[PDB]
């Protein structure tokens, strides 16, 4: 089965930094873009950063400059470095990947269990 | 019960993956080996496979109740859909590599509504009977595929109708798909019946059997007394044989290209010649 | 030998719109003859009226709009030749209602609802032209999506037992398929009904399922008799549920017994028994 | 063939009267509503009056009181009696009928050739 395992996250003071990682495992045929999403209680899930198989990146306007997304294509692992954090960055972060199960089937979006990020003030 | 194919020209038949007329015979691109279409699947003795319906009035259709957030699907006659007996309710669209635009109507109410379907999100779980409403208001609907567009995800990907969608699982076997169809090799390639599909592009929808072939096979239920059926593609005006073909019990056609089948006329008729072995070597088209 | 498809009615389609068959019915008292142009095929496989072989052509239109008129062609894009038929093959034949047709394009996005009034002087499908009614210039393909009460005469109720006027002052000018009359002696016409979307309990009758038509056109069986005695058989048990007659022109009749053909189950199969005289007296259902 | 022939019309001084008639002929099965329409220079064709087979009348607000629509079902003829004519009544008048060609066929709208009515000044 397809599995996404996240590491990192936690508590940090305002202005500090945190790093997130998420590894993709399981039987699959192809993997496209991987990325990070976040959702605070009472709000909807929003995009944080995306990285393609080639390395083309997309960032949310609220995190441009502060966040940095990286990817190890050989290990199917996506990395997120968050700098200059504010208390409004407090949410549950989810890694995401579009994976092709077989040559005959189209892609599907898969999600990780979610990592809590708490920024104090 | 002798085996037969319909005595009708291909140009007068329909696609089995959408209600569209057949406009050409084709073969897959080099990079396309197997195909796993869930619609348009019937054995030579008339056993329907996947989500294939008998009639074209069920092809590429959906039926369910929306609550504003999800559409709970049923079978097209309104009876409940039972999961894990197949990848979706009978007739559900199996077009991968594109975004779906389905025309929704209602019994007892006016107007039609376009239903925009992305087949990649986690909400898209037709094998469990639920797909995202994506703005469709609460109510009971019946819908039919109207046109397609490039898939939303992966962003920028080109339309690829040689694929089926993921019916909502992390494990391939969990959705109980119809098994893949492979080219037999040794020069034999799979034969596909193409139709032009509305949308912003030169979309060509391939299928393994015309829908009229399917209802014919399901009605005849002829015993498959052989490992392959040798066919002749005959010009009905002339009577001239335009090419040798083989039909395999699982429900697909093959041939040996010479340029080949894509240059064949579409007004021909497939005629059963005799039962032959699976190793029968065809003459190139 | 003459045969009918060995398929249950509940799995086949209507021949006047791409809709599944949901019931067997008879006409109301005030309905004598019918002149449907779709769903017309002889017992030896000769298509009549505007009847196509496949359901992918049923209740569809194709033409080029210039903002004011839609100049019709055949569904494959070849020109429509007047005085060879009442309209292009597959043109809708639903009278007594307003049409709402879903229009799409090859090479372009989106779908558009085309609202058709079949009474104005602009509506001349027999000459290849119908009013655009706001549809912008371009080439389109459309399929009937839902119907509504006819706009003219104002207040008239939906009456799907009629065909529209294809644009003429003389009946013979449009070269229609001839009317079908009840043979008499208690025999009434048998119709295959489908539920049609729209603001009402719309039931669309047809004389033959579309799958019957492609079967008859494929088999081309010599009509070696004046009438075909049929049995409506339950496929599970095999019990005969009623005697029926199929006439060479391509319609079914029966003699009703409150309890009659409308109370018959829809999962049965029509089976050819033998050739009989046109005056063979049937046992009531 | 189904044909609608109009009679009447012509020139009249303001305040005068004119009568229009419309005869329906040809092979047909039924005739529903019949009526009169007009088109003045610079405008579109507009409704004047209609009469059903039962005898129910509809009048345009602009002619209520002055015009009167009548029909002799036995002769399939509709009549329009125009009284107290003014210069705004100057137009080309058309007879209109919804006719069923056969029992099996739906209604179709048929029109007459058009009759000119001119009110002097």
Numbering used by the authors:
A (entry chain C), D (entry chain D): 1 to 121
B (entry chain A): 229 to 486, 490 to 516
C (entry chain B): 230 to 486, 489 to 516
What did the publication describing this PDB structure actually write?
We showed that the Nanobodies bound on the side (Nano-7 and Nano-62) and top (Nano-94) of the capsid-protruding (P) domain using X-ray crystallography. The S domain forms the scaffold surrounding the RNA, while the surface-exposed P domains, which are further subdivided in P1 and P2 subdomains, contain the main determinants of antigenicity and host binding epitopes.
P domain–Nano-94 complex was solved to 2.31-Å resolution. Nano-94 bound on the top of the P domain and interacted with one P domain monomer. Direct hydrogen bonds as well as electrostatic and hydrophobic interactions were observed. Interestingly, the Nano-94 binding pocket was in close proximity to the GI. HBGA pocket but lacked any common binding residues. On the contrary, Nano-94 binding was endothermic and was associated with a positive enthalpy change and large positive entropy. Incubation of VLPs with Nano-94 dramatically increased the heterogeneity and led to a peak shift to ∼1,000 nm, suggesting that Nano-94 treatment caused particle aggregation. For Nano-94, only minor rearrangements of the P domain loops were observed, implying that the mode of aggregation here was different.
